[PDB]
Amino acid sequence: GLKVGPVPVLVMSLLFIASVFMLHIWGKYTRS
Amino acid sequence: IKPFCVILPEIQKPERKIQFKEKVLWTAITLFIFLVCCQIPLFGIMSSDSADPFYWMRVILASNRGTLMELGISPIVTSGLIMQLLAGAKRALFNGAQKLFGMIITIGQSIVYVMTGMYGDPSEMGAGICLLITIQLFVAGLIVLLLDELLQKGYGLGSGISLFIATNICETIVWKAFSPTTVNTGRGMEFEGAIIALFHLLATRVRALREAFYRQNLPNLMNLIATIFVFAVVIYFQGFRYELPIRSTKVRGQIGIYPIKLFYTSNIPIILQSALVSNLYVISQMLSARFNLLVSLLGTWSAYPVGGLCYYLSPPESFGSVLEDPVHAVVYIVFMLGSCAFFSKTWIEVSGSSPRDIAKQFKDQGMVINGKRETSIYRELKKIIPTAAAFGGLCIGALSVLADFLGAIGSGTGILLAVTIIYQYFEIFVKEQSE
Amino acid sequence: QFVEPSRQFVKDSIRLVKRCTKPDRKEFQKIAMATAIGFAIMGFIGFFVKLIHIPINNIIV
Predict the structure, then answer these.
(1) Are the beta carbons of B288 and B301 closer than 8 angstroms?
(2) Alpha helices (H) in B179-220, listed in sequence order
(3) Chain A residue with the nearest C-alpha to that of C53
(4) Which domain holds residue A13?
(5) After which residues does chain B show a gap where C to N exceeds 2.5 Å?
(6) CB-CB: which of C23, C43, C60 is closest to B173?
(7) What are the residue ranges spanned by the domains of chain B?
(8) How far apart are CA B184 and CA B425, in angstroms?
(9) Which chain A residues are within 8 Å of C61, Cβ to Cβ?
(10) From A20, which residue of chain B is nearest by alpha-carbon distance?
């Protein structure tokens, strides 16, 4: 059973947000 | 299924207690994370011009079309209902299974959303972009579950559902009030926020005041006044309570007061009514759009209804609608009040707040009503609690229809949800302050 | 014969309103101030997040 704190959850949410931004940016650059 | 249930992230319980200030800070951090996640558009979306099939689910689920939080609080509600049914039909394994079923229903709902017809044409997207959107919504639902667990294990004041719903409604109201978005259709730059529009019109140009008050195509200042009035009225009616003078018998020296609030079920009637009506709306839209006289009776969708059961459930669009169709307004008001009363009276027996359950709680803890015997404790509760619940539901429905008729900002259901959830957070504030 | 059930419901409800302690000036002001603070916090955090993310949405998309 994996256990995390609140700070790991915050960091993982921020990493997901950043990953979505980089996915959009890579899509924009590849399209152009 | 044990390995499958245990292969899931979980938040460590705070063995050491957390002060109220840190709980508030973590609640604010979770709120900020959800707010950022509900404004980030999804990747791979081809088009967002079609009508929203689940537009009526947005307020109740605290969602935003096209963003990561488009499913919203759906995983939490679905998992909770699924395991409530499972428990009815027959310890951390329970939480693990709840998380697993929430993820499964999140995958299913994401598949339905992608295949619904929005995001452009799924066939043109291909199995790649659709799968990528499914992964994004899966991770968003996992984040929602993690944030709800963060708020419920002890790091946060309230639950995730209530906080997210209240935050979405409050953000919608404040945006409609102060949005700096400019919209023009041949009449100059008209600001989309009512107060900012008032300032802009006063600076640019009496006529400005009347335009800012009766601006039909945009948020009004009269609508803001109605919203403030509904806030005040709902707060005043939420302050209503019945204080039962009680003592202790099992152990002496404990004195206290037992309040039976008028809004005995705080927002559960609103949540149940909104979920039922919005589900009916979604089913009616999908059924009429896809492909019968009975379907027409379920509602002649045209997007607002122009006939049918869903029309009779819909609030009147204007005073002219009531004038031309008084029967529709009467049926709508009657259904609101009756559904609220019936849902509250059902919930007080389902959620273990029945007069019998409260009497058993009094008897086990050794609580006795002052001036009344121990045997007749249930009788006074039988006199008070059922009427309290029924009239609380009826008053909630009356406030909702009053706010809808006044054209309040954020809808009557939204305003009632916001006020009730904020009052729950206020009573949490006072509880943690006194403790 | 639903007249009698309805009459009993209305009479008992109005009696319940009579016994219920309606909030006074100080309690109403305190609860309204708390609700206003909470609503302002939530709505303005959401408002500022949306304003921050509008140019970001324009740039990234």
Answers:
(1) yes
(2) 194-204, 207-213
(3) A21
(4) 1-32
(5) 90, 205, 291, 302
(6) C43
(7) 1-177+221-435
(8) 40
(9) 24
(10) B43
